Write an enzyme that holds these catalytic residues in place. Structure first.
Site, short mmCIF file in Angstrom:
data_model
loop_
_atom_site.label_atom_id
_atom_site.label_comp_id
_atom_site.label_asym_id
_atom_site.label_seq_id
_atom_site.Cartn_x
_atom_site.Cartn_y
_atom_site.Cartn_z
N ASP A 61 1.58 21.17 30.88
CA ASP A 61 1.78 19.74 31.00
C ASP A 61 3.15 19.46 31.61
O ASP A 61 4.17 19.55 30.90
CB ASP A 61 1.65 19.09 29.61
CG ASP A 61 1.88 17.58 29.64
OD1 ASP A 61 1.89 17.01 30.76
OD2 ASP A 61 2.00 16.98 28.54
N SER A 72 6.17 8.17 46.31
CA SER A 72 5.20 8.30 47.37
C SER A 72 5.48 7.23 48.41
O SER A 72 5.93 6.16 48.08
CB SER A 72 3.77 8.17 46.83
OG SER A 72 2.82 8.02 47.87
#
Length: 330
Positions: free
Chosen positions: A35, A199
């Site tokens: 994770d 992004s």
């Protein structure tokens, strides 16, 4: 040194991936959920409340000659999905894919929430976010990667998650046979303890690319792709019959639909998520209503590039002094 381990979807939907991890002497092999959105290595154990264990493989520190109680240390964590766990701490030898760390904090669960109990395939979590998020008290502990860092040929690991198929976690090297074209690297902020990046935009299907900054975290421990409601609405508008359902808990679509791809930007590069990756199947057995793999981050407070996105790429988690993230098509 280096390590390389295969990671395997727990079910036919890729709801999570499990990677075998050797703990203790002799080795006790547990299947953990790697994770990159948390920083605790914790395991079902001989100490876990008996009624809260159902099918998991447990770590028994008393059978390990290298286990030592980390005296006085406890831990307690809650995740973004509202699940939680807590317990105490041993140090022991931990190996992933041939890569061995001695003195790793292995956090032994005394309590786990129902969600963990109900998932027989996951024996624990191995956190790969930054150690600043580690919950061990009173002495914060380092992640497996942090402990391994200076031994590694290069201070990196890579996530190569498969679509309805196994994939690979590599430590210490970049497998240049595992991706096509080039890797595009992008800056990371560690201010919140995550692999947090921006992004450069998105496109829906064959539509035009929208240049826009989307801050979010690269999180192998989250199944779906959680983005701002504007983006998510633009995606599902291209699926006939799709809608956000309060009762179900997000966007659903008619199972008879064909899903468009979703593209996200990494600097000037582009990662394409095929429409198939975005189908998470009937909301209940036999239903003709299907659950979408792109969902709104509104009310999470952070955008999350989960498995839906990460599995469309070869991802480099560069833990150099100045960390960065790299994305390549594959």
């Amino acid at each position: 040194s280096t390590g390389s381990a295969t990671t395997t979807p727990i079910d036919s939907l890729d709801d999570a991936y499990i990677t075998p991890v050797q703990i203790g002497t002799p080795a006790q092999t547990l299947n953990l959920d790697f994770d990159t959105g948390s920083s605790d290595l914790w395991v079902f154990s001989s100490e876990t409340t008996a009624s809260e264990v159902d099918g998991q493989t447990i770590y028994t520190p008393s059978k390990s000659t290298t286990a030592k109680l980390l005296s006085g240390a406890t831990w307690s964590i809650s995740y973004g999905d509202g699940s939680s766990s807590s317990g105490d701490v041993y140090t022991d030898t931990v190996s992933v894919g041939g890569l061995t760390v001695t003195g790793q904090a292995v956090e032994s669960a005394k309590k786990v929430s129902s969600s963990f109990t109900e998932d027989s395939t996951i024996d624990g979590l191995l956190g790969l976010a930054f150690s600043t998020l580690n919950t061990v008290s009173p002495t914060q502990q380092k992640t497996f990667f942090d402990n391994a860092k200076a031994s590694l040929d290069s201070p990196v690991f890579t996530a190569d998650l498969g679509y309805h198929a196994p994939g690979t976690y590599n430590f210490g090297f970049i497998d240049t046979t595992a991706y096509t074209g080039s890797i595009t690297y992008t800056a990371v902020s560690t201010k919140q303890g995550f692999w947090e990046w921006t992004s450069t935009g998105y496109a829906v299907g064959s539509g035009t690319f929208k240049s826009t900054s989307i801050d979010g975290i690269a999180d192998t421990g989250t199944t779906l792709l959680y983005l701002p409601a504007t983006v998510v609405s633009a995606y599902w508008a291209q699926v006939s019959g799709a809608k956000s359902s309060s009762s179900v808990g997000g966007y659903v679509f008619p199972c008879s639909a064909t899903l468009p791809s979703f593209t996200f930007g990494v600097g000037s590069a582009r990662i394409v998520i095929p429409g198939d990756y975005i189908d998470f199947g009937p909301i209940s057995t036999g239903s003709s209503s299907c659950f979408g793999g792109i969902q709104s981050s509104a009310g999470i407070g952070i955008n999350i590039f989960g498995d839906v996105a990460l599995k469309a790429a070869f991802v480099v988690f560069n833990g150099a002094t100045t960390p960065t993230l790299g994305f390549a098509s594959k």
